[PDB]
């Protein structure tokens, strides 16, 4: 004789997707902190003895969720700012003398252009400074901007920082966040030590390729996580255990110009430089990164072999933002040759200077139709960041090849927030149960 | 919260006690009011409300699960027992319910006398 | 797997007091049943008590109301049993055992008996002191030999209280092991022997040593057994 | 299943409550807000319910019973003909009339009861 017993609140849960908000310590900021609820000051977070779960870093639907957050970010942010449609005329270009250095030659571009006056009348003569990134010459001589002839430019508006700040991504009520607490864990599999939260670490949104920077660092020993390790085709995720200084500065004194192009409408130019002009580069110690190498060759053996020759040499093809080292160091936007960070083979004090080039019309989210202008940054500029993983890409070696090479890879932003999202899985609650027993309702 | 996941049922059994972010914190606070109000909906619907642990009036049917009672409350978990009675699951649901209308129509019976 | 540790042997006179602890490994402390069970020499088993450290209240048999009292530590997961004014009659070993439980809701609780044990402690409420064994050889030789086996062992005299463990080459030799009880002597202190059975041919080959020990008096000695020299 | 004891009688359809109970809480584009005003507009209809049901001593009960006599003003009709040559559409349409002051009736009288006894 039994009968049925209902239990409210038993320990039962399924996997599940939904949506997470937003949470940030406690006002021009392009994600919104501002409107994200504040963090509690100490977090509650409960092991689970005894329980064994399945973790997948390569079909997590929180990156997805991020990716898309960014972006709508983005894209809201770029709304009020001032249109650039009159920009796209035929400039009158000249190269830029006085005080450049033999590695400046042709850098910038003097350009003088006719401008539409705040009259709808009578036209103005103007002149600005470009690189020569941004120009394409057309048959002085006559240039036009990059992006006339694929896209609209629209010009960042000045008082909005891009400083990334932390995020905390948070679950509602009747959903968990399980994190896997293992140190050793390689991303995909079980994790036998879990506990469950209901927000993430903070996490903050840096968009960079071939290095990850400001990151988390490994516990234990350098981690090496692929979805397929022996496809070729997917890229090499290489997590630090101790981070690397990068030192960048642009170190050039510019000037900022207004130009009126219509009533209420301004546009910043860049005037002239004061001083010499230089060329912008970032620096990294040879012996830490010369460590940093050993340890990750040392780690990358185990998936090939005791005795295979590995070595690294740099990118090969594509457009510029995936064959350098982008990134953005405040307000300014870098892209950096690291062909002498992957130099070397490896057999069974100084520095190491990465010269950079400045780009102001940014293609952001491998996206087409909608460029964006950066304004010009007043002073020199100079930033410190740390170095805490890499992204890798292995070549198809066949015909009996004892020898692997791997090369700086990166351009999808999804590989860049897997890095952080990678111990977390969402849970939905199911306290309601029925069990046999055998006492009877009165 | 949580912290029985990886024990027995019966040792889990005593302790069962606009903008992008603003459109999102709107959804989680419908989301959540939802929830708890269906949660004890079908808690009240079967005469159980107010209570964490409530016996019933039905019979266990030995076709849903025929083991004993030894190795469902000191060899399994809820989380392994989940996984066995989940396609019952509606059925005892809707016993539930006519079992309380049941008792419901026979206490008006019992008062009209 | 479920594992509980007692306490070791205790020697107590007569109107003290005696305290056990136990403790557990392998379990949630607070939702696990605990029993206390004491065997006297020569009897039965006898429940004294049993208890869960989240409801709190334990529970006794009638017989020992007012002189048993069972508590509980769950930051070091440990369980003690303390009983007073105690007579002559209540020398036992004593053994903490462990069992689940489940709840249907309403102060029901329905349990499923013992089913993880310890080793127990061996309690002696007497008067006499403590007293050191003393370990002797009885060597193998022509009168200890048969049909090619030779029995050679160990004597532990004059010792108190129980019990001693005696065993051969540190827990190698268990086969033809012979450890006989103890027999209370007049003098009041135990005695008792401890032998084995050998081929005859490792005699000159083989080493054999007893270890003895009376955790009592902390008495450990090893004694090696050859045969008597002519 | 769901309203399917429409046509059958008040006595008949008085053993179908928890089939119409369940189906009540559950059962930035053109579509994006037409779906969460929906869900709003459910769950106040509900809380609304169940506050007017727990408002009269009847909280958490499908049928409850009342200490407010039937004043035979509202209908004269014999219980032989309600229960079994009725139905709750039909039902419905005569005593339509006369709701509120039932409702008010049974407040009242529930209010009382709990004010003397907890005196
Ligand atoms: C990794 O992390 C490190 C450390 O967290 C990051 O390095 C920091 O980078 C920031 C941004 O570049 C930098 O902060 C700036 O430093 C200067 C001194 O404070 C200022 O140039 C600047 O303040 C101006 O800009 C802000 C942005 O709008 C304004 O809010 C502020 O009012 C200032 O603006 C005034 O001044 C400027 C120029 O003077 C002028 O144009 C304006 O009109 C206005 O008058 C920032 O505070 C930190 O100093 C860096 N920290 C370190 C230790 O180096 C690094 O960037 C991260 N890496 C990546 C890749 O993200
Ligand atoms: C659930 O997880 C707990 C915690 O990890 C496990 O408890 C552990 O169980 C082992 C035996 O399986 C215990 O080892 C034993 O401990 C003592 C001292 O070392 C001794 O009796 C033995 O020599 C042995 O080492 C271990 O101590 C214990 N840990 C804790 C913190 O209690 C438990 O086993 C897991 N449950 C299951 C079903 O596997
Ligand atoms: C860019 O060219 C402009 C002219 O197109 C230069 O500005 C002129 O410089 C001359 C020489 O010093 C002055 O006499 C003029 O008054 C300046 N202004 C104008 C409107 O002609 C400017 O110096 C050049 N900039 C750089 C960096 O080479
Ligand atoms: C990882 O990718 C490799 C290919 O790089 C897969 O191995 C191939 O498997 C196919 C059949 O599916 C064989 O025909 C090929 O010969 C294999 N290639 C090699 C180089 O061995 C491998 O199966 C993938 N792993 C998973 C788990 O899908
Ligand atoms: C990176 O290192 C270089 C080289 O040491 C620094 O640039 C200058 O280098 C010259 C010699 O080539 C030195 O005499 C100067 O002292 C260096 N500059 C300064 C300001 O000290 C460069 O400064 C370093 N980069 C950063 C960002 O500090
Ligand atoms: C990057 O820049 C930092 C400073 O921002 C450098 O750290 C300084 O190094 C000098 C030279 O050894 C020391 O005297 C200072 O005390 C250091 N300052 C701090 C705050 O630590 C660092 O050496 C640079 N790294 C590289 C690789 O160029
Ligand atoms: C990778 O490195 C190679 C070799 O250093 C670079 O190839 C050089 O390209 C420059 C023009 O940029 C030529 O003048 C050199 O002759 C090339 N060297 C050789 C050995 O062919 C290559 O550009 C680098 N790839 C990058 C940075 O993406
Ligand atoms: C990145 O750096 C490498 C090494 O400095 C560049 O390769 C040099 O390219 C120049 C022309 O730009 C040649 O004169 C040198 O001979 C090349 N060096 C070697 C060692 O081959 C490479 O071009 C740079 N990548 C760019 C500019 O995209
Ligand atoms: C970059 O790396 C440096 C060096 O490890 C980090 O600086 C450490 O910060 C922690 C936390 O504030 C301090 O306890 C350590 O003493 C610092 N180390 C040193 C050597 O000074 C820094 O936090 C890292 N992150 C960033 C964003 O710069
Ligand atoms: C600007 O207009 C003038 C006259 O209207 C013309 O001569 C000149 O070529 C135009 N373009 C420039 C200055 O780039
Ligand atoms: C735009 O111009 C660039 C530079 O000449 C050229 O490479 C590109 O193909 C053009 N795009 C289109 C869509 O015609
Ligand atoms: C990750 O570890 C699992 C075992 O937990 C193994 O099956 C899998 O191949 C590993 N993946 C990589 C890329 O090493
Ligand atoms: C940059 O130029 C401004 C304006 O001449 C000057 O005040 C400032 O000191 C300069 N900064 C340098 C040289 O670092
Ligand atoms: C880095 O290590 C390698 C391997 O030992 C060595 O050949 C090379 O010289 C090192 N580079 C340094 C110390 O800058
Ligand atoms: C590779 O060499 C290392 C050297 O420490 C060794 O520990 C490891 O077992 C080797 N891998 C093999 C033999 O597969
Ligand atoms: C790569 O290393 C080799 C060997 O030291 C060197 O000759 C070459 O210039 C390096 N290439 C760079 C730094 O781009
Ligand atoms: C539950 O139903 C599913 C779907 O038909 C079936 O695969 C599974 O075996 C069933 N389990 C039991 C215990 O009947
Ligand atoms: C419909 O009416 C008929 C005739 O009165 C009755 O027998 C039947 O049960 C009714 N059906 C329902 C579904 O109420």
């Known amino acids: 004789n039994l009968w049925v017993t209902v239990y409210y609140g038993v320990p039962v849960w399924k996997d599940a997707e939904t949506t997470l908000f937003c949470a940030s310590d406690a006002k021009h900021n392009v994600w919104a902190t501002h409107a994200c609820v504040p963090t509690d000051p100490n977090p509650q977070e409960i092991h689970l003895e005894n329980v064994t779960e399945e973790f997948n870093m390569w079909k997590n639907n929180m990156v997805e969720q991020m990716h898309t957050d960014i972006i709508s970010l983005w894209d809201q942010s770029l709304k009020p700012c001032v249109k650039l449609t009159p920009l796209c005329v035929t400039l009158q270009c000249t190269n830029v003398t006085n005080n450049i250095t033999d590695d400046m030659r042709g850098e910038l571009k003097n350009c003088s252009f006719n401008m539409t006056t705040e009259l709808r009348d009578k036209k103005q003569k103007v002149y600005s400074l470009f690189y020569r990134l941004d120009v394409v010459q057309i048959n002085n001589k006559e240039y036009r901007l990059i992006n006339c002839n694929t896209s609209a430019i629209t010009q960042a508006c000045p008082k909005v920082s891009f400083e990334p700040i932390p995020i905390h991504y948070c679950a509602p009520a009747g959903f968990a966040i399980l994190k896997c607490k293992d140190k050793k864990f390689n991303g995909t599999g079980p994790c036998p030590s879990v506990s469950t939260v209901q927000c993430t670490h903070g996490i903050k949104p840096v968009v960079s390729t071939q290095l990850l920077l400001n990151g988390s660092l490994a516990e234990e020993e350098v981690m090496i996580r692929s979805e397929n390790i022996t496809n070729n085709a997917k890229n090499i995720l290489v997590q630090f255990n101790t981070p690397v200084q990068i030192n960048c500065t642009r170190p050039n004194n510019n000037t900022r110009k207004s130009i009126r192009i219509g009533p209420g409408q301004a546009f910043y130019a860049t005037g002239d430089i004061i001083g010499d002009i230089r060329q912008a580069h970032c620096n990294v110690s040879k012996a830490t990164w010369n460590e940093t190498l050993g340890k990750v060759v040392k780690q990358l053996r185990k998936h090939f072999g005791n005795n295979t020759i590995i070595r690294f040499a740099n990118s090969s093809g594509g457009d510029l933002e995936v064959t350098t080292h982008s990134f953005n160091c405040g307000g300014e936007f870098f892209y950096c040759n690291t062909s002498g960070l992957f130099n070397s083979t490896w057999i069974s004090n100084d520095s190491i200077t990465l010269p950079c080039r400045i780009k102001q019309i940014i293609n952001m989210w491998q996206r087409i139709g909608q460029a964006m202008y950066a304004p010009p940054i007043q002073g020199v500029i100079r930033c410190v960041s740390n170095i805490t993983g890499l992204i890798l890409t292995r070549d198809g070696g066949s015909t009996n090849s004892t020898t692997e090479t791997f090369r700086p890879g990166g351009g999808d932003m999804r590989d860049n927030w897997r890095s952080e999202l990678y111990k977390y899985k969402v849970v939905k609650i199911e306290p309601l149960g029925v069990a046999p027993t055998r006492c009877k309702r009165r | 919260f949580l912290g029985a996941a990886g024990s027995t049922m019966g040792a889990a059994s005593m302790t069962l006690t606009l903008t992008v972010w603003g459109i999102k914190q709107l959804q989680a606070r419908v989301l959540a009011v939802e929830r708890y109000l269906r949660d004890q909906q079908l808690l009240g619907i079967w005469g159980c409300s107010g209570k964490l642990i409530c016996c019933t009036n039905v019979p266990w049917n030995s076709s849903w699960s025929n083991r004993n009672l030894s190795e469902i409350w000191d060899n399994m978990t809820w989380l392994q027992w989940d996984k066995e009675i989940s396609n019952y699951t509606q059925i005892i649901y809707g016993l539930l319910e006519e079992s309380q209308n049941q008792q419901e129509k026979n206490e008006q019976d019992l008062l009209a006398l | 797997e479920v594992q509980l540790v007692q306490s070791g042997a205790e020697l107590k006179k007569a109107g003290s007091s005696v305290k056990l602890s136990c403790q557990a490994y392998g379990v949630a402390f607070s939702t696990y049943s605990f029993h206390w069970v004491r065997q006297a020499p020569g009897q039965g088993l006898e429940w004294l008590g049993g208890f869960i450290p989240l409801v709190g209240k334990p529970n006794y048999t009638n017989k020992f109301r007012g002189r048993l009292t069972i508590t509980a530590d769950e930051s070091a997961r440990t369980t003690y049993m303390e009983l007073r004014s105690l007579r002559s009659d209540d020398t036992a070993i004593y053994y903490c055992?462990?069992?689940?439980?489940?709840?249907?809701?309403?102060?029901?609780?329905?349990?499923?008996?013992?089913?993880?044990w310890g080793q127990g402690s061996t309690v002696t409420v007497s008067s006499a002191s403590t007293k050191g064994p003393s370990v002797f050889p009885l060597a193998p030789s022509s009168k200890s030999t048969s049909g090619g086996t030779a029995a050679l062992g160990c004597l532990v005299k004059d010792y108190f209280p129980e019990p001693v463990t005696v065993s051969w080459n540190s827990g190698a030799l268990t086969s033809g092991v012979h450890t006989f009880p103890a027999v209370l002597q007049s003098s009041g202190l135990y005695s008792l022997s401890s032998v084995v059975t050998v081929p005859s041919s490792s005699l000159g080959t083989q080493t054999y040593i007893c270890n003895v020990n009376h955790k009592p008096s902390n008495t450990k000695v090893d004694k090696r057994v050859e045969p008597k020299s002519c | 299943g769901f309203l399917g004891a429409a046509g059958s009688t008040m006595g008949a359809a008085s053993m179908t409550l928890t089939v119409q109970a369940r189906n009540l809480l559950s059962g930035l584009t053109v579509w994006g807000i037409k779906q969460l005003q929906a869900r709003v507009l459910a769950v106040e209809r509900y809380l609304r319910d169940q506050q007017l049901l727990g408002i009269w001593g009847c909280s958490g009960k499908l049928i409850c019973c009342t200490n407010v006599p039937w004043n035979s003003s509202w209908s004269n009709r014999n219980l032989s003909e309600i229960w079994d040559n009725m139905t709750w559409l039909q039902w419905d349409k005569e005593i339509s009339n006369y709701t509120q002051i039932i409702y008010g009736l049974l407040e009242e009288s529930q209010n009382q009861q709990e004010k003397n006894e907890q005196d």
């Open positions: 055992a462990g069992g689940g439980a489940y709840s249907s809701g309403g102060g029901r609780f329905h349990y499923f008996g013992m089913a993880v």
